[PDB]
């Protein structure tokens, strides 16, 4: 069992179950810790009723997004394992399990991370993929061989060194992992990338145009016209994540 679910238990027993149920909506009742981090004006750690709105939580506890609500790209409700939320839908969303599951995310450990418009979303998601690659125990073949593929693809998307169909390929690569692993680390690995594809594919397309016009024409997997193998190494191509 988690520590804070055990921690709340003595106070729950003393104060009674009904009092605890009074806070938060049905089936989502009580008060949770809400660590807040990222691009807010004052990062914080507070406890709050469940089913609070995002906007209110942010502006009341963390002095708001750095630059104001206009300057928000997205928010990750819960830790890195949960698909990222877009700006338009996160205005009205509720902090119970149910609403976040409805907008296709989850509370997780209520570790909200906010990213402003100055920051690059693809860099963040690539770093999460590197995290999951470093964190896989390597027992089951889907996770073990899939986290590294996801990292290798995310680096090329961060530089744009890819074709636009490789986005759909990457989506299917996530689906290769999702339901087939021994534990849910694989699910967690698959999810952030799917959120990224669902919400910020135009950003990936713009960065791929940046790679094509700016550097050169790219084939699938990052090969280029004069990309060859010479005396033990690949020469002629950037090779993202050397």
């Amino acid at each position: 069992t988690n520590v804070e679910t055990v921690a709340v238990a003595p106070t729950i027993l003393r104060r009674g179950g009904d009092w605890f149920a009074s806070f938060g909506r049905e089936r989502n009742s009580g008060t949770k810790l809400f660590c807040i981090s990222g691009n807010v004006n004052e990062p914080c750690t507070v406890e709050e009723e469940m089913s609070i709105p995002l906007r209110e939580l942010l502006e009341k506890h963390c002095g708001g997004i750095k630059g104001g609500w206009d300057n928000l790209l997205g928010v990750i409700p819960g830790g890195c394992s949960v698909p990222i939320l877009p700006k338009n839908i996160c205005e009205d969303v509720l902090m119970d399990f149910d609403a976040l599951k409805d907008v296709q995310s989850g509370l997780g450990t209520a570790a909200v991370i906010v990213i402003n418009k100055q920051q690059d979303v693809i860099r963040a998601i690539q770093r999460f993929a590197a995290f999951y690659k470093h964190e896989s125990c390597g027992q089951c073949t889907p996770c073990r061989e899939g986290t590294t593929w996801l990292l290798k693809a995310m680096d090329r998307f961060r530089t744009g060194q890819a074709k636009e169909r490789e986005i759909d390929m990457l989506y299917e690569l996530t689906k290769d992992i999702e339901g087939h692993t021994i534990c849910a680390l694989g699910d967690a690995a698959a999810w952030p990338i799917q959120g990224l594809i669902r919400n910020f594919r135009p950003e990936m397309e713009t960065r791929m145009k940046k790679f094509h016009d700016e550097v050169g024409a790219v084939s699938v997997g990052g090969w280029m016209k004069d990309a060859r193998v010479e005396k033990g190494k690949v020469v002629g191509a950037p090779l993202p994540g050397v």
Partner: protein, 693 residues
């Protein structure tokens, strides 16, 4: 009890608690897999065996999902197929493009199941390329190409659980997880050769066989191993005139699906140091000679020496077949001799356990009897060396149920906890009158294991007497449903020899032979041969016995003839000839028949069917193959043979010693093998590569 479920519409009934993959196998539904194996713990890390069950939301691992009443299983859903393709796609991402150079090629499960369930093409073209893995040196028997490892942990599971060699394991985490020893250490166990078969891909491979053939060009013959007395069933893969490799085939009542390293790797001794032409000693050198010239020289030596009665001695070696022993004994009898000896020390005398009843010199509890054991006492025996697969069997029994093992004899490195009661006959007296004797009395399935090495002692009578008295007392050790008295032979031919009565007479042991005939017989010393004796050698390899001879005759090896071998269980098994004998070598019983004709005592059979008829005449259990039947004379035999005639024998004060000094070289074949020579010097105890600390 047995529960019921449906798999792909069918109706299959299976024992409760079994894994779903066992149910699928029973119901005729094929499920792909890699990490699952019938003899290993369940692992569930490959994720190839996924299936859909209506209760679960996501597909479930079939090797590790327990069956339940009324379960509905679909192995053919679109989701299942997509799952298999996804799993294969991920499996092949970092697999090296090594098929033209991988020894597994043509018999690789990754190939076959990628072809049957994977996609036609691949999607992984990454400019960063694939992962690579260091190669690891784990001894001269198992070559390693770890780029190909798919991390199924079969090798780890086997080395830990089955053979009790814990040096193998997985180090690191995630992508960099490597199977190995984490430092330079040999995979040191007599069962190591089996990880070659277990590894579904070419990561672990036979090293002496490397690159020499491909599976589609091998002729497969089912035959019988003769390196030890267990009688392992093997498949002999040969192309043309030479034998390529030996791999195990299942016989759940003998070796399960395993063979030891000698049986696997001593095949290379069959293509070197071979005997191909008759040889005749002239001065201090051998000279090649024709079959007629050889046999006439034997006849002339017989007429000149003029042996009367027991002056014609016959010695049988560890490797020979039953038909050859029968021929030799019949010819020797027709010469008026009873001096049909075995090759072991003290083999000039009859064995102390007697010959009258089979149960006196056999593994009376079947090899499968070890599965039921609750207590075992080992007398002067080290099964790890004498019978490796049976040692693995004892180990498995010990792991999965409670079981008490004690031993009397040299301190033995065991894969299971043993209690040492002492090295002496007095220690055996103390034990059988002590706490472990009490343990045996209380036990439900006890069995006493006597090594063949004790039979070779002069004081064998005292040991057999003590054991027989204890057995005749304790009903648990010997009742009508369980015979706990067991002799563990080490040579493949001892059981058959005793079965046909290849035992010297009392007056024969007194005589000094003028003519000696060695059939195999490579454990012979300078002392056991009189200087004036005329020695004939008949074998397949050049060893010390052939060095001692005056005439040498080439005979076929066990891979080159269809013979009968009787194992420790008393089970009679038939082999099949993979190839024909090299050169001018001949089938052994034909050799004996022809030489007997030159000796004027012509044997009454000149055809294989007549040979089997004579064998039926000698004993009816030689012609009943793959059959074990218990003795009705269990109680009579013990009294009449072990306690009866062994009263007078005086126990010595000499401690029991190890029966075989070197596990890897014990036969002519094994001493003719470069691989066994390399293995012996590589796997020596005083070598740090085989230590751990």
């Amino acid at each position: 009890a047995e529960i019921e479920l449906t798999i792909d519409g069918h109706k299959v009934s299976i024992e409760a608690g079994s894994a779903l993959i066992q149910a699928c196998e029973k119901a005729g539904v094929t499920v792909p897999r890699y990490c699952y194996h019938d003899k290993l713990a369940i692992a569930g890390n490959c994720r190839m065996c996924l299936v859909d069950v209506e209760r679960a939301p996501k597909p479930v691992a079939s090797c590790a999902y327990p069956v339940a009443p009324g379960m509905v299983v679909r192995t053919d859903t679109e989701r299942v197929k997509q799952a298999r393709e996804n799993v294969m796609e991920m499996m092949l991402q970092n697999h090296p493009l090594d098929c033209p150079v991988c020894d597994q090629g043509g018999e690789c499960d990754l190939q076959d199941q990628s072809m049957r369930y994977g996609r036609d093409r691949g999607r992984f073209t990454e400019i960063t390329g694939k992962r690579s893995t260091e190669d690891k040196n784990i001894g001269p028997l198992v070559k390693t190409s770890m780029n190909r490892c798919i991390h199924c942990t079969r090798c780890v599971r086997f080395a830990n659980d089955i053979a009790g060699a814990p040096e193998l394991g997985s180090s690191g985490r995630g992508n960099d997880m490597q199977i190995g020893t984490y430092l330079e250490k040999n995979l040191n166990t007599e069962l190591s050769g089996n990880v070659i078969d277990l590894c579904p891909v070419g990561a672990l491979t036979n090293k002496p066989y490397a690159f020499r053939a491909r599976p589609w060009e091998l002729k497969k013959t089912e035959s019988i191993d003769v390196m030890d007395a267990v009688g392992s069933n093997i498949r002999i893969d040969s192309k043309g005139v030479e034998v390529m490799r030996v791999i195990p085939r299942v016989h759940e009542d003998v070796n399960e699906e395993w063979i030891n390293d000698k049986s696997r790797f001593a095949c290379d001794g069959l293509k070197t140091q071979r005997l191909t032409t008759p040889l005749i000693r002239v001065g201090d050198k051998f000279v090649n000679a024709t079959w007629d010239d050889a046999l006439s020289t034997i006849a002339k030596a017989y007429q000149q020496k003029a042996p009367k009665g027991d002056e014609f001695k016959a010695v049988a070696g560890a490797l020979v077949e039953v038909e050859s022993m029968v021929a030799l004994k019949d010819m020797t009898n027709a010469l008026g001799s009873e001096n049909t000896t075995t090759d072991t020390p003290n083999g000039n005398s009859a064995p102390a356990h007697g010959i009258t009843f089979r149960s006196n010199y056999l593994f009376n509890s079947s090899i499968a009897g070890i599965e039921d054991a609750d207590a075992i006492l080992l007398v002067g025996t080290n099964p790890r060396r004498e019978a490796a697969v049976m040692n693995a069997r004892i180990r498995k029994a010990w792991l999965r149920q409670e079981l008490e093992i004690a031993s009397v004899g040299p301190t033995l490195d065991a894969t299971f906890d043993v209690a040492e009661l002492g090295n002496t006959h007095a220690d055996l007296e103390k034990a059988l009158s002590g706490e472990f004797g009490e343990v045996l009395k209380n036990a439900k399935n006890p069995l006493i294991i006597v090594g063949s090495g004790i039979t070779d002692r002069e004081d064998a009578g005292a040991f057999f007497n003590t054991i027989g008295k204890f057995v005749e007392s304790t009903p648990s050790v010997l009742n009508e449903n369980w015979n706990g008295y067991n002799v563990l032979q080490r040579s493949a031919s001892r059981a058959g020899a005793y079965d046909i009565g290849f035992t010297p007479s009392d007056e024969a042991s007194k005589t000094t032979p003028k003519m000696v005939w060695l059939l195999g017989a490579d454990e012979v010393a300078a002392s056991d041969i009189p200087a004036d004796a005329f020695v004939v050698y008949q074998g397949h390899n050049g060893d010390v016995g052939a060095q001692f001879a005056d005439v040498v005759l080439p005979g076929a090896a066990y891979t080159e003839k269809a013979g009968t071998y009787v194992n420790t269980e008393g089970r009679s098994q038939i082999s099949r000839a993979a190839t024909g004998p090299p050169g001018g070598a001949r089938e052994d019983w034909k050799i004996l028949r022809a030489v007997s004709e030159y000796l004027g005592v012509a044997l009454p059979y000149e055809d294989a069917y007549e040979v089997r008829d004579r064998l039926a005449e000698i004993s009816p259990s030689l012609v009943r193959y793959d059959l074990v039947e218990p003795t009705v004379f269990g109680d009579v035999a013990v009294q009449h043979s072990l306690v009866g005639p062994n009263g007078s024998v005086t126990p010595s004060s000499a401690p029991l010693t190890e029966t075989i000094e070197n596990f890897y070289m014990t036969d002519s074949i094994s001493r003719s093998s470069p691989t066994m020579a390399k293995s012996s010097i590589a796997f020596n105890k005083d070598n740090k590569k085989n230590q751990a600390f």
